[PDB]
A paper describes a structure:
In this study, we determined the co-crystal structures of drimenol synthase from Aquimarina spongiae (AsDMS), which catalyzes the conversion of farnesyl pyrophosphate (1) into drimenol (2). Crystallographic analyses of the enzyme bound to substrates 1 and drimenyl monophosphate (3) demonstrated that the TCβ domain catalyzes a class II cyclization reaction initiated by protonation, whereas the HAD domain catalyzes a phosphatase-like dephosphorylation reaction dependent on a divalent metal. Our results demonstrate that AsDMS is a bifunctional dimeric enzyme, comprising a protonation-initiated sesquiterpene cyclase (TCβ) domain and a metal-dependent HAD domain responsible for the stepwise release of phosphate to produce compound 2. The crystal structure revealed that AsDMS consists of N-terminal HAD and C-terminal TCβ domains connected by a highly flexible, disordered linker.
Because wild-type AsDMS possesses a long disordered region at its N-terminus, we truncated 18 residues from the N-terminus to generate AsDMS d18. Additionally, to obtain a co-crystal structure with substrate 1, we introduced the D333N mutation into AsDMS d18 (AsDMS d18/D333N), which abolished the protonation-initiated cyclization reaction. We determined the crystal structure of AsDMS d18/D333N at 2.30 Å resolution. The HAD domain comprised a Cap lobe and a Rossmann fold lobe. The asymmetric unit of the crystal structure contained two AsDMS molecules. Gel filtration analysis was conducted to evaluate the oligomeric state of AsDMS and confirmed that the major peak corresponded to the dimer. These results suggested that AsDMS forms a dimeric structure with a C2 symmetry axis. The obtained crystal structure of AsDMS represents the first experimentally determined structure of a HAD-TCβ enzyme, revealing distinct substrate-binding pockets for the HAD and TCβ domains. Among the top 20 identified proteins, only AsDMS exhibited structural differences within the core region of the Rossmann fold, notably lacking the conventional C-terminal α-helix involved in typical folding and instead possessing an additional N-terminal α-helix. In the monomeric state, the domain pockets are oriented back-to-back.
Residue numbers in the entry:
A (entry chain A): -2 to 0, 19 to 231, 234 to 536
B (entry chain B): 20 to 53, 56 to 229, 234 to 536
The structure:
Amino acid sequence: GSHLTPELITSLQELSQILDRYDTIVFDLGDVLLHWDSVHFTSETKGIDDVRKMVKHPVWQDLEKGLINQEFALTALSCELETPCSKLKEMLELSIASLQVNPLMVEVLRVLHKKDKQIYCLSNVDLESFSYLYKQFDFWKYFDGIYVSALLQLRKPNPDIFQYLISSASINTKSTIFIDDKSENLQEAANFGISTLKYNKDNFEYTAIEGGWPIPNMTPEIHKKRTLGEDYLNLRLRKFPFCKSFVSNNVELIGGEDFSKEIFSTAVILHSYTSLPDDIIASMCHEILNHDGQNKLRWCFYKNEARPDNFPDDLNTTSMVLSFLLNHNKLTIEKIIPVAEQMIANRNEEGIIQVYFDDNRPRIDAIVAINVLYLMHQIGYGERKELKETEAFVFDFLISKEYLKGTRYYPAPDVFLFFLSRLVVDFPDQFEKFHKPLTEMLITRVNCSTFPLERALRIIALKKLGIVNRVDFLKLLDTQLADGGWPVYGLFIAPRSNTYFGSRELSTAFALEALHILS
Amino acid sequence: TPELITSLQELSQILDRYDTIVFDLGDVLLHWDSFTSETKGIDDVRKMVKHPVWQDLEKGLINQEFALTALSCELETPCSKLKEMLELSIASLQVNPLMVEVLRVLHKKDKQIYCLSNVDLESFSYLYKQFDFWKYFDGIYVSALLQLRKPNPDIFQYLISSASINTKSTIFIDDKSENLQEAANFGISTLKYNKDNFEYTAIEGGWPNMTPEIHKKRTLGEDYLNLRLRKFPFCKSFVSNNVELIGGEDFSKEIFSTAVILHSYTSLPDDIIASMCHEILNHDGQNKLRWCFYKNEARPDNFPDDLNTTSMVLSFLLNHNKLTIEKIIPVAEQMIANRNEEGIIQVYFDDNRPRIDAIVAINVLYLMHQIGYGERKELKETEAFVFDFLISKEYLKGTRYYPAPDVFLFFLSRLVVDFPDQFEKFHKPLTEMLITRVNCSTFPLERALRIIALKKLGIVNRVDFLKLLDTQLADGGWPVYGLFIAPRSNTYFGSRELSTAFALEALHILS
Ligand SMILES: [Cl-]
Ligand SMILES: [Cl-]
Ligand SMILES: [Cl-]
Ligand SMILES: [Cl-]
Ligand SMILES: [Cl-]
Ligand SMILES: [Cl-]
Ligand SMILES: [Cl-]
Ligand SMILES: [Cl-]
Ligand SMILES: [Cl-]
Ligand SMILES: [Cl-]
Ligand SMILES: [Cl-]
Ligand SMILES: [Cl-]
Ligand SMILES: [Cl-]
Ligand SMILES: [Cl-]
Ligand SMILES: [Cl-]
C-alpha cells in the first residue's frame, strides 16, 4: 500500500499540538466555520426542495466566480431545475438565514489568532452571500487575509486559486496547514506542498506534507504594464510637477480644455501614490509650498491668477496639504494646531465643520469632513468634543447609504468610501464602529463600475481592510492605453456649473497604487 | 529581391496568375491631398496617427472622442483642433482610379478578393458610406472590427484561417514593407505599390489563435442546446415584463419560438429538426396553412392567425421540401389581400385588428420572393415601408413586436442577401447601420445577430464575437432573452434555447 496514511485525530489536545506546529493556517468557510439547513419546502409544491440541487449545478460556479449575480443565477436555474424562480429565491434566503458558526472551529480560529499565527480564509462564496456573511458574523477579525471566489474570479478546486493565494500572501507552504472538508480541495493543496487537515463529523484526518518541489499566472503581463504606467507617470510629473488638469461638463472629460491652475490635484497625488520617485516628491512638494494661494498655512484651490473674485481658502485643500506636510516632516504639529482650531471655529448651526474659511459661503461635504477629521486625529485633536457632530455626519452618510448619491464636490460613491477607509484604518481605535459597515459596502460594490480610477479606489480600500479584490484589478489592466497612461477622469466638480476636473495623472497614480498594493 | 514592374500588361499577367488577391486601403485604393491654423498645437495629423494611443483606436478598444481626448493631453493641442484636422483629413481622401479599376476587373474575372486594413471603426463607417468599391470585395477585414492590427502576424493568421485562403495562389498588394514582409512569412506573394511602379516578389506558399477554447465552448453549447431540444422539441418560452426575463414564469404555449429556431440555426441534428418540424405540422393552432401564435389551450378569445408565424412557418416548410409553392401561393394571395389603406401588408389575418410591423413585413416579403411573387406590384408599398424604416433610422425605436434594433437589421439582412437583385438599394444603408452598431449592446443574442448579419454582408465582426464567448454559462447555455413582446401588456417572451441557437449560429458562421 503506497497511499499515504492520514493520522486520525480525536482529541482537542492532539489537534492543538498539530496546529501549533504550523505558522500559517488556511480555513474554508462552508462546513468548517459555518453550517446551514438546505431543505425548504415552501407554500409552492412545484419543483426541487433541496438547495443542494442549486449549489451543485454548473451555473452556481458562475455565481461563485462573480460572473453573474443571484437574480441572474436564479433565472437560469428556474429554467434548468423546472422550479419557479420565486421558490428558488425563498429556498435560498431561508438556507442563508439558518447559517450559524461552528462553535468548536470558531474557537479554534480565535485561539490560533491569539497565538499570532498567520490565518487566511479561502472559500467559494458568491458576492452577495459574502456581503451578508461579513455583516452577520464576527470571526472575520481573526483573518490576516480573505480570499473569496467572487472577488477572485477563481474557485476551488482550480489549482490557480491555490497558486494565487500562495503568491498573493507570500505563503511558505512548508509551515502551512489547510483545513477543509472536501477531499479534492485538500489534495489540490497538498500538491502545492501544504499539509492537510480533513474536517469530519467526529474526527480530523491529519496528513503532514513534506513537499519541497516548486510551484507551476498573469504575472509577466503585470510587470510590463506596471513599468509602462510608471514610465508614463514619471515623464508627466517630471515635465509638469504642478499636476495638470482638464475641465469639462462630464466625468470622462470628453472635449475638456486644459485648466491646470489648481493645486489640489498635486496634493491628491502626493497624498495617494506611495511609490513616486524621490525627485518628483520634492518637485511636487515645492509646488505645494510655493503655491500662490497659501495664506498663513491656509490653502486656496486656485493659483492667484485663476482665483475668482472673493474665492476663499477651503478646508479640503488645507487639510490634505497640512496632513501631507506633517507626515513628510515639513511642518510641526505646533504650527498646524492653530489652523485646526480655526477649522473647529468653522462649524455651522448643526455643529458640522464646513468647507470654506468664509462665513458667507457655508457648505458641508462628507469627504471634506473626513479629511478634516483625519488631520484632527493626526495632530492629537482626536478627542476634542467639538468634532462629534462632524463625525456623526460622516457616520450617517455611510449607514444611511446616502453616499450612493455622491457628495457635493465628489459625485463618485467609491471616493467617499476610499477616503473614509484612510481614516478608519489609520485610526482604528477611534473608528471601530465604522470598520464593518464600511467593509460591507465596499464588498457589495466590487466590479460595479468600469472607470479605472473607481476600480483602483475599491482595490486599495478593500486591501487595507484585509480583503483581496482581484476582479477589479484584472479589469483595471484592460483599460491602460498603449502609452502606459490610464484615461482622464473627473475626480471632483464645481457643483454650480457642473464642471469636472481631472487628469490622466490622477487616474494613472491610483491605478499604479492599486497594482502595487496587490503585488 | 523584388522584380520591378512598370508595364500594365505585365502587372495583368502577374495578377492573372493568382486566385486570391488581398488589398490594403491606404495609397492602394484611397490617397489624399493633405488649410492652416494659427491656433496652438500640432499642424499635421501625422503626430496623432503615429502616437501609441492611435493603436488603441485602430484596434477598436476606444472610439475617436476618447482618443482625441487623450491625444489632446499628450500633444498639448485643443481637442477641437485635433478633431477638425482629423475630419478634414478623412474628407480630403479620394479614390485611386487605377487601383479601383484593377479591383473592378479582378472582381469581374471571378477572383477571391479581400480587404485587409488598419482603420478605426468610425472612419471605416464613413469611408464605407463615401465610396463604392466595397462591392468588389468578397470579405472585408478591418482592424477596429477584429481587435487586431497590421503588422502583427495574428491578423494575417486570422485572415488566412477565417477566409480559408490557400497562400500558394494569394498575392498581397500593399505599400508598407513591414506589412508585406509579414505576409510573405505566411507564404503570400507581395506586390509593393509605389507611385511609379510595383515591386513584385513571388513566394512559394501552400505549407500548413484561440481555436482550442472556441471548440470547447461550441461543443458545450451544442450539447446544452441538443439536450434542451431533445427533451422539449416544442421550444419553451418564459414570460415577464423585462428583456432579461428576471422573474419570468414558464409559458411554453406558443409555436413561434420553434419556428425561429428551425429557421435560424442551421446545424441542428437531423433528429431534432424532424421532431421540431413535427411540432410545427401538428400545432393545433393551424387552419388551412395559416398559423396562430398560441396553442389552442392558450389562445385568447378571438385571437387571429398572424402573418409573422405563418410567413416563417411556410417559408421553412417550403425550404425543407414539406410543402409545394403551389399549396403556399393561395395563402400568399391572402396576405396580399391584407393591405391597409396605405397599401402596407398587415400583421393579422383579421380586418378588425389592423397592425403593421416592419419585421413582419420583411418576413412576408421574404416568402413572396421565395415563391415567385417578387414582382407583384401590390408589394410595392410594403417594400417602401421597410426601406423608409431603415433609412430614417426609425428602426432604432424597435418595431411593434420586437424592441431590439438589431432584430430588424438581422431579419432585413436575410431578405437582402437571399434576393440580392431585388434589394440592391438596401445593401449599403443596411451594412452602414450594422457597422456603426458593432459592440453597441451587451446582450448575447444581440451580439450574435450583429455577427451573423455582418458576415452575410461580407464583414467579419470579431469584437462582438469575443464578447459573446464570455457570456456563456457553465452549462453551455447563454442566458434567456426576450426576443419579442405582447406590446399592450408589455410581456416579453424568450428562452435560453433562443439565445443559445443564435450564439451558436454566430460562432458557426465565423468558423
Ligand atoms: Cl451563529
Ligand atoms: Cl468581524
Ligand atoms: Cl476557476
Ligand atoms: Cl508645471
Ligand atoms: Cl511635530
Ligand atoms: Cl452644503
Ligand atoms: Cl455632502
Ligand atoms: Cl486610534
Ligand atoms: Cl460599394
Ligand atoms: Cl498591436
Ligand atoms: Cl415538448
Ligand atoms: Cl414546389
Ligand atoms: Cl400598428
Ligand atoms: Cl413597426
Ligand atoms: Cl433576387
